[PDB]
Amino acid sequence: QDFQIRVQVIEGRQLPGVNIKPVVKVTAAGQTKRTRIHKGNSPLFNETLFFNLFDSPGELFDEPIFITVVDSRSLRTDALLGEFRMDVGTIYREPRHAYLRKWLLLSDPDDFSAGARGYLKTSLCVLGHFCLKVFRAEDLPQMDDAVNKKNLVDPFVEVSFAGKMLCSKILEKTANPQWNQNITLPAMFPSMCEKMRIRIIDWDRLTHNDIVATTYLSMSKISAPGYLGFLPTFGPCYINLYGSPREFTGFPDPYTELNTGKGEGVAYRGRLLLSLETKLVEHSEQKVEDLPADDILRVEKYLRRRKYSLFAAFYSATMLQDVDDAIQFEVSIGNYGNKFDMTCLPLASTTQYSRAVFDGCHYYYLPWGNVKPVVVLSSYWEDISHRIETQNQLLGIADRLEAGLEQVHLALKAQCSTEDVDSLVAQLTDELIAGCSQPLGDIHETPSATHLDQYLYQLRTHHLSQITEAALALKLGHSELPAALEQAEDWLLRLRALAEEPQNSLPDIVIWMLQGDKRVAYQRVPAHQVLFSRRGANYCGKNCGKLQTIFLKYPMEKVPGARMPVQIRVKLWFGLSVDEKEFNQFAEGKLSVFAETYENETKLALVGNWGTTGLTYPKFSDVTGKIKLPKDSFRPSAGWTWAGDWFVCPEHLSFVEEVFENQTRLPGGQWIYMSDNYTDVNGEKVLPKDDIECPLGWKWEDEEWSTDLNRAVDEQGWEYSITIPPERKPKHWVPAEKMYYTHRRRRWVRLRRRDGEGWEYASLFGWKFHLEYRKTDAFRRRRWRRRMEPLEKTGPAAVFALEGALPTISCIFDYGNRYHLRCYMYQARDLAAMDKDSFSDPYAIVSFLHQSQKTVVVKNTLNPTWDQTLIFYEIEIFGEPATVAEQPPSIVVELYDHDTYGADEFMGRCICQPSLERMPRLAWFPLTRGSQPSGELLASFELIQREKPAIHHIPLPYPPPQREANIYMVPQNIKPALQRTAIEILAWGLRNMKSYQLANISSPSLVVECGGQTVQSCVIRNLRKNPNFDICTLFMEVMLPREELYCPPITVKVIDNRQFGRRPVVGQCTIRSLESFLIDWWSKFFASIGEREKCGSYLEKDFDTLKVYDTQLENVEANTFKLYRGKTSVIGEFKGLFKIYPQECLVRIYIVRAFGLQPKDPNGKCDPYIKISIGKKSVSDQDNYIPCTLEPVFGKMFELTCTLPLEKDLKITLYDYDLLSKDEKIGETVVDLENRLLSKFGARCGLPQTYCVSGPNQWRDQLRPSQLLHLFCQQHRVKAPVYRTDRVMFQDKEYSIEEIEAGRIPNPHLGPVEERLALHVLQQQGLVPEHVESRPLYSPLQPDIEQGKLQMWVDLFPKALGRPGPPFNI
Ligand SMILES: [Ca+2]
Ligand SMILES: [Ca+2]
Ligand SMILES: [Ca+2]
Ligand SMILES: [Ca+2]
Ligand SMILES: [Ca+2]
Ligand SMILES: [Ca+2]
């Protein structure tokens, strides 16, 4: 009769106290447990615990569940924060016998009238006012079908907090609505809800109401506890909206769920002007009231719409895959810079279209090179720079605290001594002191200050001055390094939390990729990260003017992703238009805008010479051709001048080339070759697949341009189109084959290794242009440009004044630095398994700017050792030498599983920064498959600046030794120190698992897997009856490193031996560190208690006394491995030994006396009796219950049997008899008897101080003390003893009987002198004396309340050793 309780504890909100480290001590009917340690006032425990107890269901469904959450400081005891006492039967009677995600109150018995001590969210199981004043909105996207231009939206604001929902008035046909309404939320503070849900809703008269956006207001970010505590206030300020893309094409939008609030929004949706105050009364009331004209005038002083100037320098666009057509990049902030509305000036906000080209190993890149496209925008946003200067200062001190923190841990991992790390935490703290004594921006004189700005100003100055005084307290109070470490994360978490600015009305810069009209990949760089301030470097953004590495993501990508789209390096800049002069300090390179015109000519098929025959177009024109533009149509603007003359000009070790194929058929037919069958990468007639040859100085080493199928195509490798009028050629290709299609396109691969005046030509005007004259051309044009640069008296700040141009903007570099990268890739670990053999074939593609390579494949191994250096010869980086050194481009190493058939699969990527050290050591970079880590990689990267730069005209140490020919090896001094170890192995048993895979653990066996040197132990033949391995000793040898960072954790694995190959892998193990593996009998009974009157002269005749343990036995102070699951942790155990060098027993339980019981019954009687459950056996001692006594004398005999480990536990209870009701419980206590046998002392039989054959000290152990010490000599390899009449030898040392009985009476009960002295020697071996356990019980209703004491003593002897002595009476 057993029942089980499942308790799942999720989170807590608004806990009492400050800076706490809470944890939940869940207790079910006296059985205690503990959850995971967490941080802050809002913990996120998410743990699951289980309990079980043996009793009737009528006695288990009345028990309480305890959710006792306490604050647990590292040097302080548990202080109570929450406690409740719900009933198990209130879970059991309800449906599912369970609660699911129920919100719970918290309370404290210090003051129950205080109400909520926070909240909690939990799941059980049983097994067998706010015055929200909304003013206006603007830039709301179209959501009604056209046939007023952009006013196709009917918005109204719905606000829902704490479950109560309200709505605003509808305003039809307006993209800039003017509500000016007040909505009073009746939610009493606090509640279970923390975050406010606000949606603008497009009203529809006939269909369902579409959703515009959803923004969130976290109340803890706008409120404080506390005198420095205030009710949540917000506004009047704009909050930005994010969701689906703005382009209303009709149809169901595939990114519809983005604007419902879930996931990061992909595009700007407008903004809401709103405020909130707390008119908090307990008289709950809600209403929507139209404002008078007085409330509108107060918000107009906050809308100081300054002009904002935006800069974006696109340095590189690499890492690119699945390229379709030319790729351009659009920069926008808010609705300014959205290229689909066609309202902007012809400068627009996008880079020019660029066809990607294959980089030579795996990826593609845009070949910008020395010309970087530039996007410059103008916008109108409010002057919120007082807020942004605050949060850039707080984030700035935060990231120098964080980088200094891992700098301290870097020296600790480098084993620097105590005085170097003293200097590192010293320079951490005084630089923190200078950064924090920097004064905050006063907000008192600024009329754009709201209520929340003034409240955060007092909050920030008070709290950061507390950081200052704590830093001075650590400056003289020199504690230990861990004690300063807990403080170090404390001010870091405080500074990051205070740095939140909920009134950030500046929208994030949404940088986009467009492949045609299709928006593909995005990132929202925050506007605070790039905004400029006049006040200095500490108040500027982190990437304000600095080069920023950005990894774009797909829409609705809640993950880092499997296929990364692209990697960009943008030199973003933002700031005031009056502060745009300060861009001159940040800029580098000759910023240019090319004045341009096109002069066109023609030659038809019957002409033969270039002239004007057949050109129905203007001669001098733009790139469109139809619109005339002469040479002097583009002139220098205000601040510009020409920088040159008119001219006629357009813009490593291995490589891999891609070849292409093309065919055609009729509908209903079969595929045949066309005339254009061997063509170029776009599909037009060029030199064939074999006429493209190797250039001079290189050689082929692939035998043939081979077939390829590693792409998104069908089974035959083709992608298919249909013929579309008016041209004779198809237009849109899709990678599936259907019956309609008339053309198809294939691909190929090969590889190789290293040992007319500027005219452009086209087949027809407006058709496909290229830079060379070939046989298919009949039209042409020439590329006039003249370079224009800003005046030197204004610098590169003059680009922002390019308004009224009617052009491309490009940061031309006259030079580029030359660099040389080496990627020391030694080994990896813990990688995912992808193939059917539970292994993988890892090879790592390593990329750096455009150049990429890949390592060799290590076949069928999850712990590869490539030992390979990928050498990137002559990679060029543009910019200043100092700029690219401090901000190197990000090396991204992604691992892939090689498949001989099919396609390769993703294994995980890591982002690393190359070190400029001349020999930088290896480190572990954690691989991620996006949603989870999938291993670690022992790599290192070295980036060397070379001797000379490569000049672009105006239009190293030795290589390492080779492991294999043409494959470089990671060098000797950088390699980890592998060395020869021989390990002696022990395996003796396993303890304490649960069930696994629909069955119990019947016959487990163990395999040791250190470094691939596999050894296997024997099998525990049946663990449920004996948990013992057959064979003790084993041997193995393992290749192992010397430093614990580089060293592999030990992989052990345990497999259940089930029949016919059906063995389940029931567990694994991970050893984190290896530092541990290099006168009558009643005269004796009352003398032990202390009752002299009933003892008599037993004490005065020099007899012994056993130890009556009035408290529990755990007060006595008297290798082990732990089984590991991947997710919760510790599940079981294993016993053995590793030395690194260069089962049934007889039981006799006696229950004799109890005392200290209370009169539980209201008439004053307590009637106790025992109940002990050991396996199948149960005690039904109600037959001999003792009525109406506080101190009963049971005095009974219980002969029993036990087997390890199912019957190793002794749980004993007491119940009090009742008249008509069920016998109520008194208490319980437990002992685990396995550790008494497991100990090397052999502490099973407690030792009397002298040996006696009979009498009170009559022997009980299976062997006499001489044979016991001889057993100690065989077990611990001590030399065998020699016994005489008077003296006894141990460790060949001579001990005599006068050490025992000097001044003591030689009682006639005493046995042989050999047994007296040998028993004395085991007393010197640390053996416990004789045991009687008078263990205090504990209340199930309260684990801190004792419930009397219960005296007992237990015999336990495994029958294989011998026959124990006969029992005696009590
Ligand atoms: Ca609609
Ligand atoms: Ca509508
Ligand atoms: Ca595979
Ligand atoms: Ca594979
Ligand atoms: Ca009773
Ligand atoms: Ca009673």
Author numbering: 218 to 345, 380 to 398, 411 to 489, 511 to 935, 946 to 1049, 1066 to 1116, 1140 to 1288, 1307 to 1429, ...
Quote the study on this structure.
Ferlins are ancient membrane proteins with a unique architecture, and play central roles in crucial processes that involve Ca2+-dependent vesicle fusion. Ferlins, such as dysferlin (FER1L1), myoferlin (FER1L3), and otoferlin (FER1L2), form an ancient group of C2 domain Ca2+-sensing proteins present in almost all eukaryotic lineages. The top arch of the ferlin ring, composed of the C2C-C2D region, is rigid and exhibits only little variability across the observed functional states. In contrast, the N-terminal C2B and the C-terminal C2F-C2G domains cycle between alternative conformations and, in response to Ca2+, close the ferlin ring, promoting tight interaction with the target membrane.
To understand how ferlins are organized prior to membrane recruitment and to clarify which conformational rearrangements accompany their membrane binding, we obtained additional cryo-EM structures of Ca2+-bound soluble myoferlin (residues 1–1997) and the closely related dysferlin (residues 1–2017), at overall resolutions of ~3.2 Å and ~3.5 Å, respectively. In the lipid-free state, both ferlins adopt a generally similar ring-like structure, formed by only six C2 domains. The rigid Fercore module is well resolved and has a similar organization in both ferlin structures, including the C2C, C2CD-FerA, and C2D domains. Importantly, in both structures, C2C and C2D coordinate two divalent cations each, and alanine substitutions of seven aspartates in their top loops abolished the Ca2+- and membrane-binding activity of the Fercore. To confirm the physiological relevance of the lipid-free ferlin state, resolved here at lower-resolution for myoferlin and dysferlin, we subjected soluble dysferlin (residues 1–2017) to chemical cross-linking in the presence of Ca2+ and identified the cross-linked residues by tandem mass-spectrometry. Mapping the cross-linked lysines onto the cryo-EM structure of dysferlin (Appendix Fig. S14A–C, and Dataset EV1) indicated that 66 out of 71 observed unique cross-links (~92.96%) occurred between residues less than 35 Å apart (48/52, ~92.31%, when omitting the more dynamic C2G domain). Importantly, the existence of characteristic interfaces between C2B, C2E, C2F-dsRBD, and C2G, as observed in the lipid-free dysferlin model, was strongly supported by the cross-linking data, with only five outlier interdomain cross-links being observed, all of them involving the flexible C2G and the anchor loop of C2E. Consistent with the dysferlin cryo-EM map, our cross-linking data placed the C2E domain between C2B, C2D, and the C2F-dsRBD module. From these analyses, we conclude that the lipid-free conformation is indeed populated in solution, possibly representing the default state of ferlins in cells.
